[PDB]
Protein backbone atom coordinates (compact mmCIF):
# COMPACT_ATOMS: atom_id res chain seq x y z
CA UNK A 1 0.00 0.00 0.00
CA UNK A 2 0.86 3.72 0.05
CA UNK A 3 2.73 5.48 2.88
CA UNK A 4 1.59 8.99 4.02
CA UNK A 5 4.76 10.31 2.29
CA UNK A 6 3.72 8.49 -0.95
CA UNK A 7 0.26 10.18 -0.97
CA UNK A 8 2.05 13.50 -0.30
CA UNK A 9 4.32 12.92 -3.32
CA UNK A 10 1.22 12.08 -5.43
CA UNK A 11 -0.86 15.13 -4.33
CA UNK A 12 2.26 17.00 -5.49
CA UNK A 13 2.42 15.10 -8.87
CA UNK A 14 -1.27 15.51 -9.80
CA UNK A 15 -1.20 19.15 -8.48
CA UNK A 16 1.92 19.85 -10.66
CA UNK A 17 0.30 18.49 -13.83
CA UNK A 18 -2.90 20.36 -12.67
CA UNK A 19 -1.39 23.86 -12.54
CA UNK A 20 0.14 23.11 -15.97
CA UNK A 21 -2.79 21.56 -17.87
CA UNK A 22 -5.26 23.66 -19.89
CA UNK A 23 -8.28 21.30 -19.96
CA UNK A 24 -9.10 18.54 -17.49
CA UNK A 25 -11.91 16.00 -17.89
CA UNK A 26 -12.95 13.65 -15.04
CA UNK A 27 -14.70 10.34 -15.98
CA UNK A 28 -15.80 6.91 -14.73
CA UNK A 29 -13.21 4.26 -15.78
CA UNK A 30 -15.23 1.20 -14.55
CA UNK A 31 -15.94 -1.94 -16.57
CA UNK A 32 -12.96 -1.63 -18.87
CA UNK A 33 -10.04 -4.07 -19.48
CA UNK A 34 -6.35 -3.06 -19.46
CA UNK A 35 -6.49 -3.73 -23.24
CA UNK A 36 -8.98 -0.92 -24.09
CA UNK A 37 -7.40 1.38 -21.48
CA UNK A 38 -3.85 0.71 -22.86
CA UNK A 39 -5.59 1.80 -26.10
CA UNK A 40 -6.71 5.08 -24.39
CA UNK A 41 -3.09 5.41 -23.12
CA UNK A 42 -1.91 5.13 -26.79
CA UNK A 43 -4.63 7.58 -28.00
CA UNK A 44 -3.84 9.52 -24.80
CA UNK A 45 -0.03 9.76 -25.34
CA UNK A 46 -0.67 10.52 -29.03
CA UNK A 47 -3.23 13.36 -28.30
CA UNK A 48 -0.88 15.21 -25.89
CA UNK A 49 -2.92 13.97 -22.93
CA UNK A 50 -2.05 12.91 -19.31
CA UNK A 51 -4.12 9.85 -18.23
CA UNK A 52 -4.44 8.95 -14.52
CA UNK A 53 -6.54 6.89 -12.07
CA UNK A 54 -6.16 8.66 -8.68
CA UNK A 55 -7.82 8.48 -5.21
CA UNK A 56 -10.75 10.83 -4.58
CA UNK A 57 -9.70 12.44 -1.26
CA UNK A 58 -6.21 12.70 -2.87
CA UNK A 59 -7.83 14.49 -5.85
CA UNK A 60 -9.66 16.81 -3.39
CA UNK A 61 -6.25 18.01 -2.07
CA UNK A 62 -4.68 18.00 -5.59
CA UNK A 63 -7.70 19.96 -7.03
CA UNK A 64 -7.69 22.41 -4.07
CA UNK A 65 -4.61 23.67 -5.97
CA UNK A 66 -6.82 25.62 -8.39
CA UNK A 67 -8.74 26.38 -10.66
CA UNK A 68 -10.22 22.86 -10.72
CA UNK A 69 -11.98 23.38 -7.34
CA UNK A 70 -15.41 22.85 -9.00
CA UNK A 71 -14.73 19.11 -9.67
CA UNK A 72 -14.76 17.93 -6.00
CA UNK A 73 -18.33 16.61 -6.41
CA UNK A 74 -17.33 14.52 -9.47
CA UNK A 75 -14.95 12.68 -7.08
CA UNK A 76 -17.74 10.46 -5.58
CA UNK A 77 -17.60 7.30 -7.73
CA UNK A 78 -14.66 5.82 -9.72
CA UNK A 79 -12.40 8.60 -11.05
CA UNK A 80 -10.03 8.81 -14.06
CA UNK A 81 -8.52 12.17 -15.10
CA UNK A 82 -7.40 13.33 -18.57
CA UNK A 83 -5.18 16.42 -18.42
CA UNK A 84 -4.34 17.91 -21.79
CA UNK A 85 -1.07 19.74 -20.97
CA UNK A 86 -0.40 20.37 -24.66
CA UNK A 87 -3.60 21.69 -26.40
CA UNK A 88 -7.02 22.29 -24.81
CA UNK A 89 -9.76 19.86 -25.94
CA UNK A 90 -8.68 16.52 -27.51
CA UNK A 91 -9.60 14.92 -24.12
CA UNK A 92 -13.38 15.64 -24.21
CA UNK A 93 -13.72 14.42 -27.82
CA UNK A 94 -11.68 11.21 -27.13
CA UNK A 95 -13.55 10.30 -23.86
CA UNK A 96 -17.02 10.57 -25.47
CA UNK A 97 -16.05 8.39 -28.49
CA UNK A 98 -14.31 5.97 -26.07
CA UNK A 99 -17.51 5.96 -23.86
CA UNK A 100 -19.85 5.59 -26.91
CA UNK A 101 -17.69 2.91 -28.67
CA UNK A 102 -17.08 0.78 -25.53
CA UNK A 103 -20.68 1.39 -24.32
CA UNK A 104 -19.19 1.49 -20.80
CA UNK A 105 -18.95 4.10 -18.00
CA UNK A 106 -19.78 7.83 -18.14
CA UNK A 107 -17.45 10.82 -18.59
CA UNK A 108 -19.50 12.75 -15.94
CA UNK A 109 -18.46 16.40 -15.23
CA UNK A 110 -15.40 18.25 -16.67
CA UNK A 111 -13.29 21.40 -15.98
CA UNK A 112 -12.32 24.31 -18.27
CA UNK A 113 -11.84 28.12 -17.73
CA UNK A 114 -12.04 27.47 -13.97
CA UNK A 115 -15.59 26.18 -14.47
CA UNK A 116 -17.43 22.84 -14.38
CA UNK A 117 -19.00 21.81 -17.72
CA UNK A 118 -21.94 19.31 -17.07
CA UNK A 119 -22.23 15.79 -18.69
CA UNK A 120 -24.26 16.85 -21.78
CA UNK A 121 -22.41 20.15 -22.40
CA UNK A 122 -18.75 18.94 -22.54
CA UNK A 123 -19.71 18.79 -26.25
CA UNK A 124 -18.26 22.35 -26.05
CA UNK A 125 -14.76 20.81 -25.57
Partner 1 sequence: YVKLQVAAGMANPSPPVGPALGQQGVNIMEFCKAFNAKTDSIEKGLPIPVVITVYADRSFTFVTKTPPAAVLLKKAAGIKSGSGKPNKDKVGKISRAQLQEIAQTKAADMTGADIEAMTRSIEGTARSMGLVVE
Question: Based on CB atoms, which residue is closest to partner 1, 86 or 113?
Answer: 86
Q: Taking the complex as a whole, how short is the minimal distance between the CB of residue 45 and partner 1, in angstroms?
A: 6
Query: Contact 79/54 with Cβ under 8 angstroms?
Result: yes
Candidate segments 18-26, 37-45, 63-71, 91-99, binder of RNA by CB under 7 A: 37-45
Question: What radius of gyration, in Å, describes the C-alpha atoms of the chain?
Answer: 14
Q: Taking the complex as a whole, how short is the minimal distance between the CB of residue 50 and partner 1, in angstroms?
A: 13
Candidate segments 24-32, 90-98, 107-115, 116-124, binder of RNA by CB under 7 A: 24-32
Does 54 interact with RNA (rule: CB under 7 A)? yes
Query: Contact 67/109 with Cβ under 8 angstroms?
Result: no
Does 72 interact with RNA (rule: CB under 7 A)? no
Burial of 102 (0-12, 13-18, 19+ CB in 10 A): middle
Q: Taking the complex as a whole, how short is the minimal distance between the CB of residue 72 and RNA, in angstroms?
A: 11
* Angle subtended by helix axes 94-101 and 34-45, to nearest 10: 160
Residues 6+ apart with CB under 8 A from 29: 37, 53, 78, 79, 80, 105
Does 56 interact with RNA (rule: CB under 7 A)? yes
Does 45 interact with partner 1 (rule: CB under 8 A)? yes
Amino acid sequence: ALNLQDKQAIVAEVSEVAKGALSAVVADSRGVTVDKMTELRKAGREAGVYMRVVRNTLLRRAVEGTPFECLKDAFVGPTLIAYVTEHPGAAARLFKEFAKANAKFEVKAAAFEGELIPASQIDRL
